[PDB]
Design a protein around this nucleic acid. Sequence first.
RNA 1: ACCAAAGCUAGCUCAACAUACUAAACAAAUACAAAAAUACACCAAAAUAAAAUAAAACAUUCACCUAACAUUAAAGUAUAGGA
RNA 2: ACGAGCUACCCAUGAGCAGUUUAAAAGAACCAACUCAUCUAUGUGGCAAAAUAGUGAGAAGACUUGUAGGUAGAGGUGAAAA
RNA 3: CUCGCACACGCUUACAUCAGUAACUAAUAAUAUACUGAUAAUUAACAACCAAUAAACCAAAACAACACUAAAACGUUUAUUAAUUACAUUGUUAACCCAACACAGGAGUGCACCAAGGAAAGAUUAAAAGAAGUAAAAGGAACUCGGCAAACACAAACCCCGCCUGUUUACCAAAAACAUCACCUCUAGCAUUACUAGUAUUAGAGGCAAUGCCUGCCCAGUGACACCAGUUUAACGGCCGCGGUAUUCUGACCGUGCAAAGGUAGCAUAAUCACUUGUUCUCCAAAUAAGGACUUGUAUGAAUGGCCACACGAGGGUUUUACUGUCUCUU
Lengths: 46, 240, 393, 339, 122
Amino acid sequence: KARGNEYQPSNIKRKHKHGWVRRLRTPTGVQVILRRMHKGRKSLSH
Amino acid sequence: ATSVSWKSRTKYTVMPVKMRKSGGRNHTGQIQVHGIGGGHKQRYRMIDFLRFRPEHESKPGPFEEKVIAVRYDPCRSADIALVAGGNRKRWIIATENMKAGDTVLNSDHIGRMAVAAREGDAHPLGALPVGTLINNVESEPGRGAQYIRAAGTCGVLLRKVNGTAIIQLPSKRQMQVLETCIATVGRVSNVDHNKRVIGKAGRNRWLGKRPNSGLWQRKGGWAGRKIRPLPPMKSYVKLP
Amino acid sequence: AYEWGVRSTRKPEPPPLDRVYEIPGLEPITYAGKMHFMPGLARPVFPPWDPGWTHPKFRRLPPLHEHPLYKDQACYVFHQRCRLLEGVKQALWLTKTQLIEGLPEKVLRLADDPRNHIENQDERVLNAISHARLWHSTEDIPKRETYCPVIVDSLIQLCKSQILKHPSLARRICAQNNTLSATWNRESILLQVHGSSGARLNAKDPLPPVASQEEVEATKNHVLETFYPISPTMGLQECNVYDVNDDTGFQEGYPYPCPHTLYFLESANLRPRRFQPDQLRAKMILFAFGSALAQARLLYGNDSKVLEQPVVVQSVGTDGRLFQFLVLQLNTTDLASDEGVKNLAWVDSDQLLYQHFWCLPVIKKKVVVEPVGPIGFQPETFRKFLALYLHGA
Amino acid sequence: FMKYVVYPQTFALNADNWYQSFTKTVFLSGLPPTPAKLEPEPTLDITALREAVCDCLLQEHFFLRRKKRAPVIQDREAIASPFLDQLVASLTGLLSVHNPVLAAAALDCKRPVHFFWLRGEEIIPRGHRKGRVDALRYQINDKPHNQIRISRQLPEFVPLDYSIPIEVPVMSCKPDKLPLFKRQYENTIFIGSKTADPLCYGHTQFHLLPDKLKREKLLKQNCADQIEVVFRANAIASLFAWTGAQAMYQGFWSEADVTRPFVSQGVITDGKYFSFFCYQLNTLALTAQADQNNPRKNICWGTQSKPLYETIEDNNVKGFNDDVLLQLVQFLLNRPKED
Amino acid sequence: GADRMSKWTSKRGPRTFCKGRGAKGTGFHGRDGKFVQIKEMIPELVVPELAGFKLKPYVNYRAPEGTDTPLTAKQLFLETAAPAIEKDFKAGTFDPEHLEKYGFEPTQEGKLFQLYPKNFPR
RNA sequence: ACCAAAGCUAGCUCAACAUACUAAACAAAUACAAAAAUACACCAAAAUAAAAUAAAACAUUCACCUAACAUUAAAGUAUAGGA
RNA sequence: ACGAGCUACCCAUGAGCAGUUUAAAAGAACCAACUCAUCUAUGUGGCAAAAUAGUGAGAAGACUUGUAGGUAGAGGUGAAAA
RNA sequence: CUCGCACACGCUUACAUCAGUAACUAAUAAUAUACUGAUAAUUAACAACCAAUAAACCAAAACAACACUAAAACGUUUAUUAAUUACAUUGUUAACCCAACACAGGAGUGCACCAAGGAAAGAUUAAAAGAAGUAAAAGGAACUCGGCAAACACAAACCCCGCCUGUUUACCAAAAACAUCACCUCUAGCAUUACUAGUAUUAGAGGCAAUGCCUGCCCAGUGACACCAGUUUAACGGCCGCGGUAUUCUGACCGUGCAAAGGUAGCAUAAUCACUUGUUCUCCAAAUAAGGACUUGUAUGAAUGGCCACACGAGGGUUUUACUGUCUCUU
Ligand SMILES: [Mg+2]
Ligand SMILES: [Mg+2]
Ligand SMILES: [Mg+2]
Ligand SMILES: [Mg+2]
Ligand SMILES: [Mg+2]
Ligand SMILES: [Mg+2]
Ligand SMILES: [Mg+2]
Ligand SMILES: [Mg+2]
Ligand SMILES: [Mg+2]
Ligand SMILES: [Mg+2]
Ligand SMILES: [Mg+2]
Ligand SMILES: [Mg+2]
Ligand SMILES: [Mg+2]
Ligand SMILES: [Mg+2]
Ligand SMILES: [Mg+2]
Ligand SMILES: [Mg+2]
Ligand SMILES: [Mg+2]
Ligand SMILES: [Mg+2]
Ligand SMILES: [Mg+2]
Ligand SMILES: [Mg+2]
Ligand SMILES: [Mg+2]
Ligand SMILES: [Mg+2]
Ligand SMILES: [Mg+2]
Ligand SMILES: [Mg+2]
Ligand SMILES: [Mg+2]
Ligand SMILES: [Mg+2]
Ligand SMILES: [Mg+2]
Ligand SMILES: [Mg+2]
Ligand SMILES: [Mg+2]
Ligand SMILES: [Mg+2]
Ligand SMILES: [Mg+2]
Ligand SMILES: [Mg+2]
Ligand SMILES: [Mg+2]
Ligand SMILES: [Mg+2]
Ligand SMILES: [Mg+2]
Ligand SMILES: [Mg+2]
Ligand SMILES: [Mg+2]
Ligand SMILES: [Mg+2]
Ligand SMILES: [Mg+2]
Ligand SMILES: [Mg+2]
Ligand SMILES: [Mg+2]
Ligand SMILES: [Mg+2]
Ligand SMILES: [Mg+2]
Ligand SMILES: [Mg+2]
Ligand SMILES: [Mg+2]
Ligand SMILES: [Mg+2]
Ligand SMILES: [Mg+2]
Ligand SMILES: [Mg+2]
Ligand SMILES: [Mg+2]
Ligand SMILES: [Mg+2]
Ligand SMILES: [Mg+2]
Ligand SMILES: [Mg+2]
Ligand SMILES: [Mg+2]
Ligand SMILES: [Mg+2]
Ligand SMILES: [Mg+2]
Ligand SMILES: [Mg+2]
Ligand SMILES: [Mg+2]
Ligand SMILES: [Mg+2]
Ligand SMILES: [Mg+2]
Ligand SMILES: [Mg+2]
Ligand SMILES: [Mg+2]
Ligand SMILES: [Mg+2]
Ligand SMILES: [Mg+2]
Ligand SMILES: [Mg+2]
Ligand SMILES: [Mg+2]
Ligand SMILES: [Mg+2]
Ligand SMILES: [Mg+2]
Ligand SMILES: [Mg+2]
Ligand SMILES: [Mg+2]
C-alpha cells in the first residue's frame, strides 16, 4: 500500500550484513574495504 | 551460505528423532524440486531395514522377536512395527496382518526343503516356495531392504535357478538377485492406501505439497499413451 | 547394511599431507616458525599437545576402563527412570516374587474398620483433592509437576493427623533423595537396584510379616512366568563401573532403621515423560525389593539363605489421580536358583481417587452444566492409603 | 501500573527501617505479653522433643547418604532445607496431641505468598506525566519454606487501639536507593491457597535464609550489624504480606480498615541459628487518602537470634540450646480461643 | 538509517548484546550458573606505610634541578657490576662461565617477576 | 537607503632531480556483532577479458584498452586484412 | 561488486483467535480483535510519492504475525499477474 | 472526546534542575518534552553471558478422564569428570521507532476500557461555490449505462461463468483469470546434503478441473518411443469438395471425386466473425434488455473437455414487492 518505510532497523541484521567480520570473510568484501580505505572513508563498515 | 543436513545421528535409537524439513532446496539454497514445503511437523522413527541383524556375533543363527505395537509413521506410507529381541528393540516395516503380541522369525538358513512361509517371518530367497509373495527385497547380500516398501505393495517370487532368485516387482519388472538375499514375506501393511480420498486442497498442504504452478504449458511429443515393451530383467549377480 | 552417518555431517577427514612429506630424507619447509598460516609453505604436522600440568576442567575425559571400579563383568543397573518392557512380569522374574491381586487381609481389615477413620474423612479428602488440583497455586490450571507432590503431601498429612488417637506414628521419619544400592545374582546375571526414589518413610519398629505360612509354602509350587523373545534385563542400564556392596541409604546406628513406605510420583507434564502404569508397578516392585534386600543383608548377613523372619515393605505410586499400592514381603536371599521359596508381592492396581477434576465451570448453551470440583470420587482408595499408613501401628 | 517489588530476603544494608517505613510497622524487641491465663497444659516431654530434634539434625547432617558432592564447600541450603522440613513435620506431629488444632491444620511446603498494597503518593519526576500525583505501589512475592494454616484465627496479642511511644521510622530519601526497582506484572494477593480454601487463617511461617545472607558471608562483606537486620527485614516483610493477605481474604481493605487484629508468627532459620517473631496487623489503610487520620499501627515483636546446636560432629550434638526449643514449642502450642 | 560514526557499545544493541566496557575478568562460571570469583585474579594493591614518610607531592621552589641524564644500560651496568667484576679480576678468581652471582639471570622462566614476558602489570 | 559589490591569500596544476617507494601514531583494545584480556585447530581456491564503437547494416575483422624497452631512420615499407 | 531489514517462496524458533449456533477446531454459519481491500465520496504539490470517511470479504485456517537464516540478475522466486 | 500502562525491537540524552528566549526549532503566539547554556542522571533481585561424555527411555498438546489425524516444540535419572574462593561484566532516562517534517500512514506481546490519556474552536461575520450530516409536503426509480449513492427497506426469484474455501497484477484490472479435491497421460528398479535418511499403493514432468452421463472417428503430416518398419492423439492436431433436386434459399438426399478419417453424443443467435436488433412467446402501456422454444454453429462440439444439478460468489445481467431527495423540484 504505502511505501517509503522499507527500512526496519535491527542491529543484528545490520552487523551480520554489513559488518567488519562479514566484509572480511569474503575476498570481495576485502576488496570493498580496500576501496573504502583508498577513498579515505571515515567508516569502512557498520 | 551452505546448510547442514539434519541426518547427523550415528547411534540407532527407538524413540523418534526430530527432523528439519527442506522444501525442494538443496544444500546451496536453490530449489531443486518444486511443490514441496509448508507441511506438518514430523519426527523421524529410524527403521532397521536390515531385518536379519543378530544382536551379537556369538549367536549368528536364526532368532525370534516379539511385536510390541504396530504404529503410524508419517515419514512413509506403510505402518511400522516395534519388535523386541534380547536387549534391543527395532522399528521394522509391518506386514498386512501384524498385530501386537505376534512372533516373527529372522533366519539366514537355506535347506533342500522349502520352509512354511509365515507372514512376519524373514527368510533368504533360496528357502521360500516358488510362488511366494514377498516384500522388503534386498539386492546384494547384507545390503539392506531398498526394494519393495510401500503400503500394500509386494513382489512375487518367480523361479530359482543356479543358486539365484528371480522376483517380479510391483512395476511388473523382473529382478534377478542372489538366492541368499533376505526378504520379508507377505504384503506390506495399509493395503487400502490407494483408496484414500483427499477431501480438500488443504490436506495436500498438510501433507506438504505446494500447489502446482499456474503457467500453462502446451503438451509436447512426450505425452500420449506410449505402449512400451517391458524392460529386460535387471540382474545384480556378478558373472565372472 | 545402511550406516546412520551422513558423510557431509561426519567429521571431515584431514586433508592429504603435502607431497614433500613423501620424499625420504627431505625435511619440509613449513610455516610453524612464523606462528601463522601462509600459502606456499607445507602444512606442519604436530604431535598431540601435552599440557604438562593437568587441569581439571580443560582435560580430556578419562576413559571408562581407567576407573579403579571398572569390572569386566557387566552389571545391569535399575535406577529411578528405567522402563521395563513387560513391567510386572519382568519385575517378578528379576526379584523372584509371586504376584497377588488383593491387598493383604490385615491391611484390608484395617481399612474396612470404621474406627480407624479420621473425623471428617469425606469432606477432608475432597478438600485436599480440591486444594491440590486447583487451590494450591494462583494459576488457573495447575500442572501435574505441581499437584502430584502437593496431593501426596496432603494425604500424608491427613494420615499423620491420626497420631492423637494412635500414639505410635511418632516412631517414623521422612527421607528425601538418599542413595540406595542393592545387588544380587539372578541366573548368572549381576543385577543391581541403584539410585534414589521419590520419598521414603523410616521407622524404629520392624513391620510384622503379612504372609501366612500356608501361603509361603504354596509359593514354592509356583513357577515364574517366562517370556522367551525378550531377555529379562531389557530396559536396565548395562554398565561396567559399579560397586558390589549392599550400601543402604543411611549409615550405621540410624535410629529409624526399618523402611515402611516408599512414595513414587509421576509428576511430569508430558505423557511420554510419565511412566506407564505397568512400568510404575515394575519400578515400585524393584525398589521395594532392593530396600528389603538391603535391610535383610544389614540385619542377618550376606549369606544367601531363606529368611526365617521375612522383611515386608510398602510402596505407593501416584500419577496425580491414579494410585498403585504395593506390599512386598521378602522371604529369601538366595535368588540364583529358581526352585526354592519365592518372595510375595500384593499389588493393588488402578485405584482411582477421582475420575476427573474441573478447574473451571463448564457452560453449555448459556448455562453451567457441571460445577467446579472433582467428578466422581472413590473413598476406598484413600481408605487403602490410610490402611497402608497405619499398618505399622 | 508500575510498582516496587519488595524482597523479604534482601541484601540491602539497612532494610528493616525501609520496610517499616513502607509498612507502618513498629518493631519491638522481645516477645509480646503472654496470656498467663493458660491452663496447666504443657506437661509434654522435653526429653522426647529434644530427642526428635537431635534425630532430625543427625539424619540431615551425618546419617543421610546423599549423592557424592564434588564441591568441598558443602553448601548449607541443601542440608538445612530438608532439616527444616523434617523438624516442622516432627514437631507438629508430636505437639498435635497437646494442641488439637495442629491435627486439622494444613502444612504448606514452599507455597508462594503474595501481597499488593499502596503507601503514600509521589510526584512523577520524568515522562509526559511529569508533575502529576501518583501513588506508590508495592508487591511482596514470598515463598515461605513452611506454613501452617488453621481454620480459626489466633488470639490478638494487644488491643486494636494499642498505643506505642515509638513512632514509625520515616526515611527522607527515595525508595530507589534501598535499592529497589519498579516492575510491572500481575499484582496478586495470595495466602498460599485460593479464597475457596476453608483454611483462610494462618498459624506460623518458617523462613530459611539463603546462602547469600550467611553470617560468614556478611562478615566477609564487612557487615557485622546486618546479621540481625536481615532477620528483621525478612520477618517484617513476610509476616506483613501474609497477615495482609489474610485480612483481604476476610474482606478488609484500605477503605474497609480491619476491625480485628490479625496475628501471625514467624521462625527464621539460618543453617544453624534460629530467630522468632510475632506480627500483629492492626491497620490496612496504608494509602495516603486513608492515612490522614489513621492512628493505628502494625506491631512486630522480635527476638535475638540464638543458635540451636553447636558445631556437631560424628552423630553427637555437642551443644544444644533448650531456649530455642521452648520458643518453638510455645509458638506451636499457641491456640485460637475456644467458643 | 542507523549511524556509523558512533561507537558500537553495549547500550546500542539488543538484550543479547552485552559487551564489556574494558574491565578485566575476575573469575569464571560455576556449576549451578552462578559466577565464581577467583581471589588470585583480583589485583591486590601493595600500598606502603606513609605515616613516617617525610616527602610531599610538591618540591621546594628554590631547590635546584639537574641536567637530564636518562639512565641507560651502560650506566646501570657500571653502577651494579663493574666494580665487582674489576675487583674479582684483580683478585684472579673471576669465572667467565658463572655469572649468576653478579645478578645475571640466564633464564627468566625461574623467577617470579619476569622481564621479557612481563608477568607483572605495574 | 536596504539588498549588496571589491580585495589576496589559503592552496592547487604541469614537468626535472631524487633518496630508491604502503607517511606520523601505534600505552591498552582491535577480522565475538572490530576496537570485548583469557581454551584442544582445521586451513585454503585457480579456469582467455567482453562489450559499447568502426566497417555508414552486421555475422570474419575493429589501433590504445592497466602485460616494459627508450630515441633518430628504415616506414606507414614488407606483409595481414568480408584483401 | 552491493542488495531477500520491502517484497516472492522456503528453513528454524515463538505467539494470537474473545462471544453465539452446532454429537464438531466441519479448509461449516453469525460476528469481534486481527488480516485483506468490493463500491462510493473527499483528497490530486494531498494527512499520505496510494491516504481519510462510510461501506465491504475472511475471521480454527491453503490463517495472521514477531525474531533470525537462505535462494541474486545470462539469475532468484512465482496458487503465471511476464 | 476517549488507544492507556509496561515489556521486546528501534533512536541514542532529544529525559531531569536552574536560567534565557532579540533571533534560531515548534509551519502562529503564550512558553518550552521538541530551541540555547550550565549542572546532574539510569544503582539488581528483572534481563544478557551462564557443562560436557555414555546409558534407561515408542505411547502428543487441546482443563486431558480418553480419543481423532495432519502424528505433533516443550524431560528426568544413573555412571565419569564439572578450577570452588563474599562483593564479576553488561542493559536500566525519555514525550522516543520506520515514513525528507513535532506527518490523519506502518508497527510484536501481556494487561484493563479508565482508577489512566487528552482538546474538535486564534478572534469575529454568517456572501457565493465546495465537503459532511440531519429533516422534508404529494409521488416512490419517473434519475441514470446501471437502484451508483442514500434510505423508517436490509426480502423472494430467473440466467451466464467458475464446482466449493483460497490466490493474483504492492501503486488504475480481485475477475469468468490461477490454484483446487477428483480423473488421466508420460519419466524413473534406486543410497549417505535436494527428491530422501523415501523405494512403483512411491517420487518427479504436465493436462483438465469435485461429483452425475459421457469423452465419438483419425497416426495422412510434425513430434515422442522406436535408433529402419511399427506404436502412440486424456501427444501437436484434424474430422471434405463438386453436380443435381427443395418456386429463390438445403448442412437433407441421390451420384461422383479426394481423403487418415470426413463432426458422433450433447448443447445451440452463446462471452461463439459478420449477417444481427435471426424468428416466435412470456415479462412492460411501451424492451436492441432478461427468460423459454426453433435453430443450419457452412467459423459449436466432447480432458486445448461436451452437457445438465445442490451449495457457494464484494463476479456479470434481468424481475417482484419494501424503501427512500436518485428524480418531478428542490428547501
Ligand atoms: Mg528511502
Ligand atoms: Mg514425507
Ligand atoms: Mg503414514
Ligand atoms: Mg497436478
Ligand atoms: Mg494449468
Ligand atoms: Mg546512514
Ligand atoms: Mg545492549
Ligand atoms: Mg532494548
Ligand atoms: Mg557472584
Ligand atoms: Mg557499426
Ligand atoms: Mg555514423
Ligand atoms: Mg540496426
Ligand atoms: Mg547499428
Ligand atoms: Mg576491443
Ligand atoms: Mg586469405
Ligand atoms: Mg535473509
Ligand atoms: Mg525476510
Ligand atoms: Mg472462536
Ligand atoms: Mg469458517
Ligand atoms: Mg478504509
Ligand atoms: Mg453517509
Ligand atoms: Mg470494518
Ligand atoms: Mg463476514
Ligand atoms: Mg461466507
Ligand atoms: Mg541479451
Ligand atoms: Mg528467471
Ligand atoms: Mg496469462
Ligand atoms: Mg500478457
Ligand atoms: Mg533518529
Ligand atoms: Mg535541553
Ligand atoms: Mg516562532
Ligand atoms: Mg523506561
Ligand atoms: Mg482557529
Ligand atoms: Mg453553503
Ligand atoms: Mg448537502
Ligand atoms: Mg436522512
Ligand atoms: Mg419527500
Ligand atoms: Mg429508466
Ligand atoms: Mg431517462
Ligand atoms: Mg448500494
Ligand atoms: Mg429490499
Ligand atoms: Mg437492496
Ligand atoms: Mg471461484
Ligand atoms: Mg459442495
Ligand atoms: Mg472467494
Ligand atoms: Mg502467494
Ligand atoms: Mg495482494
Ligand atoms: Mg492494482
Ligand atoms: Mg475476491
Ligand atoms: Mg482494486
Ligand atoms: Mg480454471
Ligand atoms: Mg471417470
Ligand atoms: Mg484451462
Ligand atoms: Mg467434468
Ligand atoms: Mg477425443
Ligand atoms: Mg504418426
Ligand atoms: Mg506412421
Ligand atoms: Mg490452431
Ligand atoms: Mg434449386
Ligand atoms: Mg436446445
Ligand atoms: Mg455471432
Ligand atoms: Mg433497465
Ligand atoms: Mg446463421
Ligand atoms: Mg471449429
Ligand atoms: Mg473450441
Ligand atoms: Mg487437444
Ligand atoms: Mg450471485
Ligand atoms: Mg467474486
Ligand atoms: Mg425546507
